Write a protein that binds this DNA or RNA. Structure first.
Ligand code: ATP
Ligand code: MG
Ligand code: MG
Ligand code: ZN
Ligand code: ZN
Ligand code: ZN
Lengths: 159, 98, 49, 196, 65, 133, 266, 85, 43, 783, 114
RNA sequence: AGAGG
DNA sequence: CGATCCTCTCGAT
């Protein structure tokens, strides 16, 4: 693998290095191996980075991986967009999936979680646990046919 | 050289719709598939008794022409006997940009 | 120019669409992978025409 | 559409005079755009045209069969025999101005198809009309005089814009909207009203 | 479906050259191109008009009522 | 003013290079041992052969809409063969006092190099180019 | 005679080949447009179908009838019904033709443009007689009938310009070329290895002096001298296509001159 | 209550896309409903174009209540709010 | 019409792909785009 | 899902769409019948009373007319039947449901609506005929083709609903995309093609034409510019009259490859004031490019002003090309005889190279690296030699193509077409692939029964030797067909996949919006981010700018930034400063020049530690380069005179400018620190750009000009900030979603390859979003 | 269905005059004549003739949209020359040019035999 | 179902 | 327990 690294003169230069690409994961045990740089060691198993190095590193590898689908395809999406998603998935302590498992079971609304999946099962658990709908979310106001607190209705006009 | 058989004609690997395309062998793989779905939505004489049938929707070209460019397969599919289009004189040009 | 091959049912022309299935009485062996107690399986779909 | 997966709607109609012309006084019935050939790779379209040109002059059919030995070269050979520039091109003049076009045009016959689905069988417009039985929303289909579906995709599109009011209006004032009576105690739609 | 009157492209009257064209081929034992030309059909837009024409009328007439 | 520069140059190289109507011409002055030239010429209206003696002038005279000439009795500052109108775009100072000019005659480009081209071009988005014989 | 010069090389009953010397492109072209469109002619513009037992649709028949070319000689002494005072049409604005044909013969019965009949009082005008150029005397074949079939209809032929419907074209194709040597460099010939050997040189090359290879390009030269061939359909004779061509163009310029004079008052 | 005082207001002194759009909206709604115009309409007739002129002149008597996540709010005059955009 | 009369439907390992074995039996071009892609075949 | 989230709506339209060279970007051609069906409730005000009374008189079947007069007390007086429709003496307060007339705001769309730009407010222009007409440069954000697309239309019913449309969703507003921080619309098709043709140095236009072209630009000063040529013919350059569509104050600069200040190849770009100086206008200049003429006009001159530009450019270019003309024939596929022999031998040698590796493998001599089979290593070699073959033969074609080659002409403009197209159409199609590997053994030990068993040769395993011009053999044909099918199948797979991914992402981020504290929070009010994008900047207001303190040798860094007034050689001389000599060995000003230098070296390190590889160009608000270039032109910067600034001016000027680049407002600890961080990166840029030496020696700025640069930077920055209420959640979800769904559906073209992605790809992104415990390619890269 | 009547191409409508002469807002001594129910047959011809008048500074025409039979002619003349006149003179010149042509073609036709 | 982009 | 969008047609119980 080629590397952009600074010359003693100061400028950045190509200095090819030996890297090992592995088929299979055991990050924990591999980094404790001598003659390796455990500061640099990487895996496409961002779930394992989350487990070995902590949430913050997990977040990084997740972006590294989200970015990599997008760019190792041709396209460019501004950092912040992919950054927002990664943050959403992260900011909880762990990896929250973009599925009915992850985000849909979250501490959110009620009428807003039935907008996605398991519509009736979400509505029944609401009627069982006697859930209180905040009516803050977009989806809530959509059902209510009221102006949501989005852009234009985010503030309040007065006299 | 150890042959047991010979093809009657490769043109025959194709079916009815593709058998209508001129020089399919000089076309990008899908473009061929497209024209296959397309030619099935093209107007003209579907049968001679059109004037005698009570059917929901019937579209018939006023003066359908036979193609100036034909496949040999077409003969069997009675194309030049019951055509789908007209031999329009077409310019490939940037004109009014319309 | 008509070719037939269709039916007329309650005044409407009906094409009977040729339906594709895998032929029976055929002996086919399959490799069953990783989360499986059986490595390989030899199958036969015996029919009576 | 041409016989090569080349769909296109008529953009405009021009009458003979405004159309570009050959010094023979030949004029097209149709004008396709050069920018629908390189990416499409409909090379046969070009061969078809060239061959049909030869065919019309020679007064013989075109052997557009696939695994032929017929070449662009062999065709082009004949087209030049027929006094035209071999590669389909022709000098044309601008109908408005009468001046020669700086570009020469690949022009000739090409079998084109008149396909079903025409603007007028498609145009629809609605502004209050057949409201659905149960749902109380505009009906489906142009025939029924239905309202167009403003899907979630479209709701999302509007949330992104921050168009809060339009979204509420597009979902209430237009389409649905209703007025129910709620209890200040239990908070349910079981309130009997004598609105007079 | 009967020989159109006038060529779509140019307008030269073609609706009169039909039977005339068929004699040239049948009786006079001529070839298509020469026969087309013999009818004064010089331009290719006029050429196609008659050459690619399929006269289904003959077939429709055939129907009994 | 009036004039802003004057010299006789002898063509070194003549290059069409993927163009028909235009040629990039390379020349030097008969007088100044340092004075260089580079120019895009409409070789269709004024063809230039290899090694041609030609008087090059840069004026600024003969804002406001262009009127068709109509010879009449209106005489412009020319009894020349080739005339152009450009715009100053850079003034590259090199070794010692070696000043190079930069003009675009509607995309056709100039590059006159020398020494004494001081209060003679003064960044003026004007300037006309004149060629003789 | 003073300005623009005409030199007729070939002339026939329905075709004129000539040269147009001492003229501007705009004029040559504008003439070609007015010849295509703007010349009035007579054409069927209303078919009233009593009986139609043919294989063909009523409108399909009506369409062909419109295309049938008919005498447009004394067409300047027939009014545009739009500006005629009658409720609908009359003898001063329309020509009324009739068609009745019945397949009586065991063989196929052919209906020709020859079978149309004027019923309108023409008031001695050379107008609406279906033009027949066909050797055998029959016109355009309109329809065909089996032994059974009948077709009974009435036609109203009216004054109109091609610019409204192509049927009104005294038109047909107009050949048009200027500078067969591209001395003007008014087009850049596409080539593979050689422009000269690949492009076939014009019939009009004989009438001009071939370039000069190692000679300067004529930058000041202006396109003049136009090689033209006007084809008549038959409604109006060839001479009249170009004479009426010149005339109607001359007319619309005059209306624009007269237009100015009306705004001049108030 | 909650109500943040006039002193200490960390929100943008600049009007937001949305505020501009809702202001121009509401004003056009009033003008369209035969309400009074506080600006010398230079032959103007469109309620939004009139609201536009009113905005430029800063003669729109409306106040944006900016809500914060805790529930608190900062009120700003349409006239005090900087209209760059 | 003729084309409709020569149609095939394959309900439900890689059923959509044009198999080598289709040579001379099925048309390689004729197949609808999406949903029924490579399941609806033409002889 | 279908009755609450989505609904069927009234005041809706939809019909076939067509292109319009004579329409304004922001306009929509509305067919007369449609205009006559869709209404708008207009309250009767004295401003409108007369226009409205007239409309009521016109009635439902005349165009500028209405249907229904709704007075007070409900009452819908129906204009089509009412026995009073004839009179009607309107009262104020009453509403009139008038027909949708010219210049009304409408929301126009094209499904799938997987993008904020698939929905845009348009100005009505009622027209004859049945299609919806649109400006060709709005084709891309909607993803429209004129092959039969349908496009829907929605009518706002309230004044506040109309304001929302015109002040937020307007087409000119939506020009600069916040997805890719680059602009979404540009010059396309004929206009792109022609602009190149017109901008040729060889392209010369006469007066007659010039005048028509000039009158064609609707803005036009009504002043004929002086011709470039005043020799035996007043001749204008193409570049010249097109510069009339380019507004003044527009400064643009490029440098492509061989681009010198003389660009002998006529490449790069130079536009000073509002006139092109050199460089052919093509995609890089007038396309959806981040540093294009569009990004510049939209930023510098305004969005409305820029939207107007699209029109002008099209009006001239289109007219010029209507008169120039442009075609494509079979001729543009036929490459040289001598060239065919080269292509032919290129294939021949690749084919022999293949036979050799095969014969070597068959002799049990070919030894694979590690991690892969002798068979595995064999295939990728053969695969490589065969692609290398097609590519080499393809370039052979491309190079041999003349400048008059209509296909080369198109790729040259970047209007349509690519290298591969040339290659395939004229030289060699290439190797066919299914599931990555080249055509497999469907039959026993062969790909077809026309072959013998165990034939690993290029032709047997699906290598197409022939071009589309030459034609394909039945085997080649069927193999091309096999690979072709792959594309069609994966569309019908990936589109149903990517589209689901979209709704999931969209539902997962719906409620994420910037609050009135730059905080990015959800419905529960939980902090997702403390500043949007970690900088509280609006995505639309950001563009890639080079950080010069990050790269280069310490040597070059010194040469550039260092100023030692205490050193005779290494100080700034008095040629470029009024106070120059008066400052040699200042000690007190050397203390400021030194403090400046240390911050400049502090960053150099900091940046090398954040951007580890040493990547200079990063997307940052405020294009400083443009501001500088602007000041230079605005103040007609006399590069020969010294200057009027002091070291104290530049140093404390840049220093104070940074204290005023506000994102957050709080006077407290965390907030002032959050603000301090938010700006860190931009400040590096700012300092790197506005350091003393660089200001004087490089830019050669004046005090008047500098003061303005500071005010411009401050203002631009403030504009560049995120607006509270920005629906950043939906935005991000769509900004990731839209590309995915379109990396397929496209899907294709062609048949070789175009995978990875489909393949890499949507299944991986699926693994990621689903948090797949059991991934397919678990890799570990050890250093 | 939403198409206009083909006579809308040459027939003037409700009120509607042929020429609408409006003063140019920008440059002096210039005017914008809007020709109603007209094309390139008249536009180009008047335009090209105007360009022969060695006292007409500017003369160009445009057909803003193809759907409509209507064209805009811009004329700028030298101080002390009304553009209305420059047009009048141009129009007159064309009629005369065409006059000769009719007379000439007519003459030549009679000499021709077929 | 079938079909359209 | 989920599996892209919208549209348009015919016409089975
Ligand atoms: N199944 C589908 N679901 C959603 N959108 C679709 C679907 N099929 C097509 N589309 C949309 O419409 C377009 C249909 O392809 P289209 O025929 O218009 O364009 P294309 O890829 O450029 O090919 P062509 O060369 O025929 O123009 C897509 O690119 C996409 O936006
Ligand atoms: Mg398309
Ligand atoms: Mg499309
Ligand atoms: Zn209660
Ligand atoms: Zn013809
Ligand atoms: Zn009458």
């Amino acid at each position: 693998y080629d590397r952009k690294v600074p010359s003693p003169t100061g400028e950045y230069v190509k200095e090819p290095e030996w890297v090992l690409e592995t088929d299979g994961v055991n990050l924990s045990e591999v980094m404790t191996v001598p003659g390796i740089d455990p500061t640099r060691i990487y895996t496409n198993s961002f779930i394992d980075i989350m487990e070995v190095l902590g949430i913050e590193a997990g977040r990084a590898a997740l972006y590294k991986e989200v970015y990599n689908v997008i760019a190792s395809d041709g396209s460019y999406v501004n950092y912040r967009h992919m950054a927002l998603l990664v943050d959403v998935m992260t900011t909880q302590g762990g990896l929250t999936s973009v599925t009915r498992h992850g985000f849909n079971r979250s501490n959110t609304g009620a009428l807003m979680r039935c907008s996605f999946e398991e519509t009736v099962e979400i509505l029944f658990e609401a009627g069982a646990s006697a859930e209180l709908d905040d009516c803050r979310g977009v989806s809530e106001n959509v059902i209510l046919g009221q102006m949501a607190p989005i852009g234009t209705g985010a503030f309040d006009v007065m006299i | 050289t150890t042959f047991t058989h010979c093809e009657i004609h490769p043109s025959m690997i194709l079916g009815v719709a593709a058998s209508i395309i001129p020089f399919p062998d000089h076309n990008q793989s899908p473009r061929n598939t497209y024209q296959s779905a397309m030619g099935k939505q093209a107007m003209g004489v579907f049968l001679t008794n059109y004037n005698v049938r009570m059917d929901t929707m019937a579209n018939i070209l006023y003066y359908p022409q036979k193609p100036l460019g034909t496949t040999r397969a077409m003969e069997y599919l009675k194309f030049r006997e019951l055509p789908a289009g007209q031999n329009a004189i077409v310019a490939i040009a940037c004109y009014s940009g319309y | 120019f008509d070719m037939g091959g269709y039916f007329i049912i309650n005044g409407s022309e009906k094409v009977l669409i040729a339906q594709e299935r895998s032929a029976g009485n055929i002996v086919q062996v399959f490799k069953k992978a990783a989360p499986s107690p059986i490595s390989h399986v030899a199958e036969i779909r015996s029919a009576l025409e | 559409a041409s016989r090569h997966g080349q769909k296109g709607t008529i953009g405009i109609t021009y009458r003979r005079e405004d159309m570009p012309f050959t010094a023979e006084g030949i004029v097209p019935d149709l004008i396709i755009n050069p920018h629908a050939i390189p990416s499409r790779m409909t090379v046969a379209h070009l061969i078809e045209c060239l061959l049909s040109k030869v065919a019309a002059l020679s007064g013989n059919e075109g052997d557009a069969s696939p695994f032929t030995d017929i070449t662009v070269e062999g065709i082009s050979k004949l087209l030049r025999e027929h006094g035209y520039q071999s590669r389909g091109f022709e000098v044309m003049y601008n109908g408005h101005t009468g001046k020669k076009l700086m570009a020469q045009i690949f022009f000739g016959p090409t079998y084109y198809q008149r396909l079903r689905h025409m603007v007028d069988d498609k145009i629809h417009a609605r502004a209050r009309g057949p409201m659905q039985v149960l749902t109380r929303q505009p009906v489906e289909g142009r025939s029924r005089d239905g309202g167009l579906r403003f899907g979630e995709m479209e709701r999302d599109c509007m949330i992104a814009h921050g168009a809060a009011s339009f979204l509420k209006e597009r979902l209430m004032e237009a389409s649905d909207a209703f007025r129910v009576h709620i209890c200040g105690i239990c908070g349910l739609m079981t309130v009997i009203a004598k609105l007079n | 479906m009967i020989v159109p009157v006038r060529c779509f492209s140019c307008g030269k009257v073609v609706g009169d050259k039909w039977e005339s064209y068929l004699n040239l081929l049948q009786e006079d034992e001529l070839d298509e191109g020469t026969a087309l030309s013999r009818l004064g059909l010089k331009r290719y837009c006029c050429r196609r008009m008659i050459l690619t024409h399929v006269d289904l009328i003959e077939k429709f007439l055939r129907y009994n009522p | 003013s009036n004039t802003l520069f004057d010299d006789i140059f002898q063509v070194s190289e003549v290059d069409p290079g993927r163009y028909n109507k235009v040629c990039r011409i390379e020349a030097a002055s008969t007088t100044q041992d340092q004075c260089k030239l580079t120019l895009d010429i409409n070789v269709e209206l004024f063809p230039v052969a290899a090694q041609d003696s030609l008087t090059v002038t840069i004026a600024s005279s003969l804002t406001r809409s262009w009127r068709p000439p109509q010879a009449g009795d209106r005489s412009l500052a020319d009894d020349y063969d080739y005339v152009m109108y450009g715009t100053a775009y850079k003034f590259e100072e090199v070794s010692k006092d070696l000043i190079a000019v930069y003009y675009s005659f509607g995309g056709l480009l100039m590059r006159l190099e020398g020494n004494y081209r001081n209060l003679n071009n003064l960044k003026q988005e004007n300037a006309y180019l004149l060629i003789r014989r | 005679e003073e300005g623009p010069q005409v030199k007729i090389r070939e002339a026939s009953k329905d075709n004129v080949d000539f040269i147009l010397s001492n003229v501007d492109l705009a004029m040559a072209n504008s003439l070609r447009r007015v010849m295509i469109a703007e010349i009035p002619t007579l054409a069927i513009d209303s078919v009233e179908v009593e009986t139609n037992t043919t294989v063909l649709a009523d409108e399909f028949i009506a369409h062909r009838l419109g295309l049938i070319p008919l005498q447009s000689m004394d067409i300047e002494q027939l009014e545009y019904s739009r500006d005629c005072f009658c409720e609908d049409h009359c003898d001063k604005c329309s020509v009324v033709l009739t068609l009745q044909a019945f397949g009586e013969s065991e063989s196929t019965t052919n209906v020709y443009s020859k079978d149309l009949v004027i019923v309108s009082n023409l008031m001695g005008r050379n107008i609406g007689h279906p033009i027949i150029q066909d050797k055998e005397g029959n016109g355009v074949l309109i329809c065909k009938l089996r032994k059974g079939q009948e077709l009974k209809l009435t036609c109203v032929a009216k004054k109109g310009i091609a610019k409204e419907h192509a049927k009104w074209g005294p038109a047909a194709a107009i050949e048009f070329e200027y500078d067969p040597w591209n001395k003007l460099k008014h087009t850049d010939y596409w080539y593979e290895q050689d422009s000269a050997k690949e492009w076939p040189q014009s019939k009009n090359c004989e009438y001009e002096d071939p370039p000069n290879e190692g000679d300067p390009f004529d930058y000041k030269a202006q396109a003049d001298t136009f090689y033209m061939n006007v084809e008549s359909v038959g409604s109006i004779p060839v001479d009249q296509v170009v004479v009426r061509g010149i005339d109607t163009l001359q007319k619309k310029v005059a209306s624009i001159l007269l237009a100015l004079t009306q705004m001049d008052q108030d | 209550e909650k109500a943040i005082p006039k002193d200490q207001r960390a929100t943008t002194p600049y009007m937001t896309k949305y505020e501009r759009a809702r202001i121009l909206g509401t004003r056009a709604l009033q003008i369209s409903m035969n309400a009074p115009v506080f600006v010398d309409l230079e032959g103007e007739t469109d309620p939004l174009r009139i609201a536009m002129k009113e905005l430029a002149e800063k003669k729109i008597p409306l106040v944006i209540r900016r809500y914060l996540p805790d529930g608190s709010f900062e009120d700003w005059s349409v006239e005090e709010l900087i209209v760059d955009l | 019409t003729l084309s409709h009369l020569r149609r095939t439907n394959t309900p439900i390992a890689k059923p959509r792909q044009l198999h080598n074995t289709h040579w001379g039996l099925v048309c390689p071009a004729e197949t609808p785009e999406g949903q029924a892609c490579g399941l609806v075949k033409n002889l | 899902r279908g009755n609450l989230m989505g609904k069927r709506v009234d005041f809706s339209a939809r019909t076939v769409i067509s292109g319009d060279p004579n329409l304004e970007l922001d306009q929509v051609g509305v067919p007369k019948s449609i205009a006559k069906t869709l209404t708008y409730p207009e309250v009767v005000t004295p401003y409108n009373i007369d226009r409205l009374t007239q409309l009521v008189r016109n009635g439902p079947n005349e165009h500028p007319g209405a249907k229904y007069v709704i007075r007070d007390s409900g009452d819908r007086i129906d204009l089509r039947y009412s026995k009073r429709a004839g009179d009607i003496q309107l009262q104020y307060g009453w509403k009139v449901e008038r027909h949708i007339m010219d210049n009304d705001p409408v929301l126009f769309n094209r499904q799938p609506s997987l993008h904020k730009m698939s929905m845009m407010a348009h100005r009505v222009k009622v027209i004859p005929y049945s299609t919806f007409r649109l400006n060709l440069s709005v084709t891309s954000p909607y993803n429209a083709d004129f092959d039969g697309d349908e496009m829907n239309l929605h009518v706002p019913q309230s004044e506040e609903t109309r304001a929302e449309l015109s002040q937020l969703c307007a087409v000119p507003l939506q020009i600069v995309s916040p997805q890719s921080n680059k602009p979404c619309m540009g010059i396309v098709q004929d206009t792109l093609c022609g602009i190149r043709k017109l901008t040729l140095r060889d392209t010369f236009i006469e007066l007659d034409q010039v005048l028509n072209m000039l009158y064609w630009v609707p803005d036009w000063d009504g002043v004929i510019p002086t011709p470039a040529i005043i020799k035996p013919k007043p001749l204008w350059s193409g570049k010249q009259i097109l510069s009339v569509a380019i507004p003044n104050g527009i400064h643009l600069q490029r440098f492509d490859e061989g681009t010198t200040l003389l660009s002998p190849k006529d490449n790069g770009m130079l536009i000073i004031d509002g006139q092109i100086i050199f460089g052919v206008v093509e995609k890089k200049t007038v396309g959806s490019s981040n540093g294009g003429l569009i990004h510049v006009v939209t930023r510098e001159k305004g969005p409305q002003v820029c939207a107007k530009l699209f029109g002008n450019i099209q009006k001239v270019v289109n007219f010029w090309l209507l008169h120039n003309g442009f075609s494509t024939g079979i001729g543009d596929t036929i490459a040289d005889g001598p060239t065919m022999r080269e292509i032919t031998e290129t294939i021949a040698e690749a084919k022999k190279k293949v036979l050799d590796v095969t014969k070597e493998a068959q002799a049990n001599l070919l030894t694979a690296k590690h991690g892969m089979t002798l068979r595995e290593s064999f295939e990728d070699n053969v695969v490589r030699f065969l692609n290398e073959a097609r590519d080499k033969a393809g370039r052979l074609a491309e190079v041999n193509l003349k400048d008059l080659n209509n296909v080369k002409q198109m790729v040259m403009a970047g209007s349509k077409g690519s290298f591969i197209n040339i290659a395939q159409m004229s030289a060699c199609v290439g190797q066919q692939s299914v599931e990555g590997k080249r055509i497999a053994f469907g039959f026993v030990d062969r790909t077809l029964p026309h072959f013998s068993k165990d034939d690993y040769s290029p032709e047997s395993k699906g290598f197409v030797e022939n071009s589309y011009l030459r034609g394909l053999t039945p085997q080649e044909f069927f193999f091309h067909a096999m690979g072709g099918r792959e594309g069609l199948i994966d569309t019908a797979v990936k589109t149903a996949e990517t589209g689901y991914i979209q709704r999931r992402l969209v539902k997962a981020l719906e409620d994420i919006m910037v609050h009135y504290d730059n905080t990015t929070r959800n419905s529960l009010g939980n902090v997702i981010q403390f500043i949007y994008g970690e900088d509280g900047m609006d995505a639309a207001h950001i563009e890639k700018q080079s950080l010069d303190t990050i790269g280069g040798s310490d040597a070059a860094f010194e040469k550039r930034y260092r100023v030692d007034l205490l050193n005779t050689d290494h100080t700034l001389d008095p040629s470029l400063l009024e106070s120059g000599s008066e400052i040699l060995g200042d000690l007190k000003l050397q203390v400021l020049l030194d403090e400046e230098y240390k911050q400049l070296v502090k960053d150099r390190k900091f940046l090398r530690e954040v951007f580890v590889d040493g990547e200079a160009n990063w997307p940052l608000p405020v294009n400083i380069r443009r501001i500088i270039q602007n000041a230079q032109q605005t103040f007609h910067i006399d590069h020969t005179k010294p200057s009027d600034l002091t070291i104290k001016d530049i140093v404390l000027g840049v220093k104070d400018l940074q204290e005023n680049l506000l994102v957050l407002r709080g006077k407290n600890e965390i907030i002032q620190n959050a603000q301090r961080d938010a700006v860190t990166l931009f400040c590096c840029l700012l300092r790197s750009r506005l350091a003393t030496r660089r200001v004087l020696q490089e830019y050669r700025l004046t005090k008047q000009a500098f003061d303005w640069v500071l005010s411009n930077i401050e203002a631009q920055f403030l504009r560049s900030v995120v607006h509270p209420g920005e629906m950043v959640g939906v935005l991000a979800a769509q900004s990731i979603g839209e590309p995915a769904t379109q990396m397929t559906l496209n899907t294709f073209h062609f048949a070789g390859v175009a995978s990875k992605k489909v393949t890499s790809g949507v299944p991986r992104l699926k693994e990621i979003l689903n948090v797949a415990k059991n991934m397919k390619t678990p890799s570990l890269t050890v250093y | 269905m939403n198409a206009p009547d083909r006579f809308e191409l040459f027939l003037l409508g409700e009120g509607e005059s042929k020429l609408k002469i409006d003063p140019d807002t920008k440059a002096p001594n210039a005017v914008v004549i809007t020709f109603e129910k007209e094309d390139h047959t008249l536009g180009n011809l008047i335009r090209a003739e105007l360009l022969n008048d060695r006292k007409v500074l500017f003369a160009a025409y445009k057909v803003e949209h193809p759907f409509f039979a209507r064209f805009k002619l811009r004329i700028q003349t030298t101080e002390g020359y009304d553009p209305k006149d420059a047009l009048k003179n141009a129009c007159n010149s064309i009629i005369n040019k065409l006059g000769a042509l009719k007379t000439n073609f007519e003459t030549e036709w009679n000499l021709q035999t077929l």
